[PDB]
Amino acid sequence: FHKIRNEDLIFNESLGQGTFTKIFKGVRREVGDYGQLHETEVLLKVLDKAHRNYSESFFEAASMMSKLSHKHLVLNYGVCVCGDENILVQEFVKFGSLDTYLKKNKNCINILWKLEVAKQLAAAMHFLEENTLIHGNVCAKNILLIREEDRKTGNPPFIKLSDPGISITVLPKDILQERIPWVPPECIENPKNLNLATDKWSFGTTLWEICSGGDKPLSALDSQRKLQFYEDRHQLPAPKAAELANLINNCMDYEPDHRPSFRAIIRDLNSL
Ligand SMILES: c1nc2c(NC3CCCCC3)nc(Nc3ccc(N4CCOCC4)cc3)nc2[nH]1
């Protein structure tokens, strides 16, 4: 990772929090191409000091996203490690997270918008699958909107996938359980079971989110009831906008080997 000086980072407004993290908008002072000085908007992700013993997995998650270059993956700019502070410096994405956007605009996002975003997510996941790279935390909170639909020029929305955060292979079991039904049943059974098939299941859950106006599936269930939902081999209810319900259920197959390839998923989306 490129090291960024603490003195070159300005922290501004809080945008939210993740698992053991706090997230801020900020500014990076840098020398750009041609030696020109710039002050650039950036996303600053800060690992909680109390959880600094997770720093390796915190940074490894961003490393994954920088292994490859792709138009649908958020860019990492560098890191700042100062004292007990572990900071990831990333691309600031203008319109924020997809789950909040879907809720704010639930009454003016139509099925073609949802389909285009699903296709873009599937394109990203196909790229990762071809590179045998596991993401491990596909969810609408980890999708960011670079630009909105422009109905007048026929320009679609454009999304990027963000880094997965600290891996479910090291997180406390209670956090994995709270993340049902994004975490697949085999990973609840054994977090070592994390596999490319993991991301097909989570992709299904994320499609459910995309079709549900920012509702969170099973949010009314406490953790014990979420665990029992998997024990009973239940499926999520069809979204009211049900056009992708079959694909959701095909991806959320309790048998990992039966989940479709992302090539097959894209074929299904393109046939709609
Ligand atoms: C990598 N990770 C990113 C973000 N993650 C946030 C993490 C906390 C919840 C909101 C998204 N936000 C980013 N930008 C935001 C842009 C607008 C935002 N909102 C717009 C709608 O009104 C609320 C703020 C929020 C975050 N960019 C980014 N790159």
Curated annotation (Swiss-Prot):
Domain of life: Eukaryota
Keyword Magnesium set for record: yes
Segments forming domain Protein kinase: 9-272
Effect caused by changing V81F: In PV, THCYT3 and AML; risk factor for Budd-Chiari syndrome; somatic mutation in a high percentage of patients with essential thrombocythemia or myelofibrosis; leads to constitutive tyrosine phosphorylation activity that promotes cytokine hypersensitivity; no effect on its ability to up-regulate potassium voltage-gated channel activity of KCNA3
Site location (Breakpoint for translocation to form PCM1-JAK2 fusion protein): D174, I175
Job of this protein: Non-receptor tyrosine kinase involved in various processes such as cell growth, development, differentiation or histone modifications. Mediates essential signaling events in both innate and adaptive immunity. In the cytoplasm, plays a pivotal role in signal transduction via its association with type I receptors such as growth hormone (GHR), prolactin (PRLR), leptin (LEPR), erythropoietin (EPOR), thrombopoietin receptor (MPL/TPOR); or type II receptors including IFN-alpha, IFN-beta, IFN-gamma and multiple interleukins.
Protein family according to the UniProt entry: Belongs to the protein kinase superfamily. Tyr protein kinase family. JAK subfamily.
Protein name: Tyrosine-protein kinase JAK2
Top-level taxonomy: Eukaryota, Metazoa, Chordata, Craniata, Vertebrata
